[PDB]
Design a protein around this ligand. Structure first.
Ligand SMILES: [Ca+2]
Ligand SMILES: [Ca+2]
Length: 649
């Protein structure tokens, strides 16, 4: 095994990587790693949180400087053939002496039965109703206690679901060729609001990576055709804002060319299903995307104050190629647009389709349902008027949208979204802006989507994992843990905004979460929610030290990993929009290096959750113990005990 003087013997933490942890005092010492009589030492100096190249030991050992007392982790990685190593520091709460725990399991696991700590893989035999186990390096003092007969994931349940929420554009660029669809440009600045180039092909390439994390639902940003152009970014227009996040839809009937082809979507869904991963589309029915110079020029709608030679002089051959000059911002292009012109702006969606404070359109209302959210065109979902297609679709010959006798705007929207479910076997939707569209519209969407999936599963019996119905979760801003009227208008679970602040209060002491977990375990006996630490419209949860994984994945109800939670993806450039930094590029360089053991930690807790529906669905009994923190959860035949030894410092 791997050893160094004055550290315990290294133990495997993910295949081909071995770690050791110890509370080390301030000072200096030599650093060599031994495997049998093989000796290795850092060859290029010693820094924290960096992959250190190693050489066979020669002369005086490299001197490692301990600038701060704390729990240090040494990591050795043999997956490159030559050992590389890594050094990292973790600098009224139960305390842990770092030594083995004796656990009373007499009420949980049978006398003489074998119990596994899933995290370490250590197995103990129940004797006098007790087992003794050492929490493994990287466990943070957790024992994940299960019957040793546990061997593989339990049947999928939405009430035990591990959802991975990915902004496809900011994850993996599978094909650079499709990065600049419809004349879209990078800004050459910090790319705050641009298409980075992430696509469905790229996302498909990481399905094994997600499967290893115990992910069994993949929530993707809408892949449907967005506005082609940009608007002013943030409060100051310091960046161009493109529809990289999928929330500014223009054509519901087509895939966005940046995301890829129909074939790419079919491969993503089919390969995801092959690995027991359900697909959720992020969907919008509340609004279409903003008017952009790209779309105005392409589809011949709107009105400009620029007439004569002044037009091509100012905005150029392609208006979307305009950049702000001296004394201008990315909002300044609006100065050239005549938003008051009735005739010009009717050529866009048309008066029968949207509310907006432009031209001759129905004015937005002064309520959540009919307001124009952030000046977005509000789709008339409640309208009973037979609309025909949007006016500007007359200049969009590539659309799959067809006029249908008697159809209202809502009928088109529910038909368009349902057709993706029918054609590809999409397992569910995450519904955006749920509080801004009337309940009856969401019920219609659910009914048609349910029919669509049943039709696909019947037509594709080889591909269908089960006969489970279509699943729908919604973002109703500020929704908590309660069975609201949403649950009686087509929603199987609502996104839980309240978990984030409760997790934050347990960031420095995991045991603080107990009351929240007891409440949620009891409340969610009768319904389901989708809880998160991080989101695109809140913040990235990075205060948990190494404990974010257990804080999320041991929560009752369905849980949502925001892409990069597993790798501590940093908050990115944000400009004058405080939310933009949450959509930073996936940190793949860190995943394969300094965040490698974090990813392994997430994989272990994620896999434990996938084996045990009791976690997501079980009644909780919090244990009374003289040392540490512990609870049991039980759902049908499934029973687990989670022990947390406490803080090692
Ligand atoms: Ca791409
Ligand atoms: Ca609305």
């Amino acid at each position: 095994a791997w050893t160094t003087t004055d550290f315990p013997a290294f133990t495997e933490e993910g295949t081909g990587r071995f770690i050791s942890q110890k509370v080390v005092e301030k000072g200096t010492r030599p650093l060599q790693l031994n495997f049998d009589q093989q000796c290795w030492q850092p060859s290029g100096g010693i820094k924290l949180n960096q992959m250190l190249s190693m050489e066979p030991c020669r002369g005086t050992p490299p001197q490692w400087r301990i600038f701060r007392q704390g729990l240090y982790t040494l990591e050795v990685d043999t997956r490159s053939g030559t050992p590389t190593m890594m050094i990292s520091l973790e600098e009224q709460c139960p305390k842990w002496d770092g030594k083995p725990l004796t656990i009373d399991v007499s009420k949980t696991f049978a006398e003489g039965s074998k119990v596994r700590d899933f995290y370490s893989g250590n197995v103990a035999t129940v004797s006098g109703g007790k087992i003794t186990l050492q929490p493994a390096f990287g466990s943070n003092g957790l024992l994940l206690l299960e019957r040793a007969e546990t061997a593989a994931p339990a049947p999928f349940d939405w009430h035990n679901a591990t959802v991975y929420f990915v902004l496809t554009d900011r994850f993996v660029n599978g094909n650079p060729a499709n990065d600049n669809s419809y004349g879209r440009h990078k800004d050459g600045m910090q790319e705050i609001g641009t298409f980075h180039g992430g696509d469905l092909q790229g996302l498909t390439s990481k399905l094994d990576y997600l499967q290893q994390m115990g992910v069994n639902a993949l929530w993707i940003s809408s892949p449907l055709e967005q506005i082609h152009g940009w608007v002013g970014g943030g409060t100051k227009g310091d960046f161009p804002h493109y529809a990289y996040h999928g929330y500014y839809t223009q054509d519901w009937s087509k895939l966005d060319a940046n995301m890829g082809t129909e074939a790419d979507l079919r491969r993503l869904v089919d390969e995801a299903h092959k690995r027991g991963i359900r697909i959720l589309f992020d969907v919008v029915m509340n609004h279409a995307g903003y008017a952009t110079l790209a779309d105005m020029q392409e589809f011949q709608f709107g009105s400009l104050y620029l007439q004569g030679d002044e037009l091509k002089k100012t905005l150029g051959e392609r208006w979307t190629d305009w950049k702000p000059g001296a004394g201008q911002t990315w909002h300044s292009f609006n100065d050239y647009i005549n938003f008051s012109d009735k005739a010009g702006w009717e050529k866009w969606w048309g008066k029968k389709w949207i509310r907006i404070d432009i031209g001759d359109y129905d004015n937005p209302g002064y309520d959540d349902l009919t307001m124009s959210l952030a000046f977005l065109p509000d789709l008339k979902t409640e309208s009973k008027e037979i609309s025909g297609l949007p006016n500007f679709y007359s200049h969009k010959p590539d659309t799959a949208a067809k006029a249908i006798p008697g159809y209202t705007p809502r009928d088109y929207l529910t038909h368009w979204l349902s057709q993706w479910v029918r054609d590809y076997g999409i397992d569910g939707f995450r519904v955006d802006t749920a509080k801004h569209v009337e309940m009856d519209a969401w019920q219609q969407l659910k009914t048609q989507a349910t029919a669509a999936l049943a039709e696909w599963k019947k037509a594709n019996p080889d591909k269908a994992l089960d006969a489970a119905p279509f699943w729908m979760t919604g973002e109703a801003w500020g929704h908590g843990v309660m069975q609201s009227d949403y649950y009686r208008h087509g929603f199987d679970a609502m996104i839980n905004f309240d978990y984030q602040d409760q997790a934050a209060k347990a960031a420095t002491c995991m045991a603080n979460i107990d009351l929240t977990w007891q409440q949620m375990a009891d409340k969610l006996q009768s319904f389901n929610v989708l809880s998160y630490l991080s989101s695109h419209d809140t913040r990235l949860f990075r205060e948990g030290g190494a404990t974010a994984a257990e804080l999320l994945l041991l929560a009752p109800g369905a849980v949502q990993i925001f892409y990069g939670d597993e790798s501590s993806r940093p908050f990115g450039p944000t400009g004058s929009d405080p939310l933009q930094g949450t959509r930073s590029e996936m940190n793949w360089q860190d995943v394969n290096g300094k965040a490698a053991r974090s990813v392994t930690h997430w994989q272990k807790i994620g896999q434990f959750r996938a084996r045990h529906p009791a976690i997501g669905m079980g009644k909780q009994t919090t244990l009374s113990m003289s040392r540490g923190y512990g609870f049991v959860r039980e759902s049908g035949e499934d029973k687990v005990m989670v022990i947390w030894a406490g803080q090692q410092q």
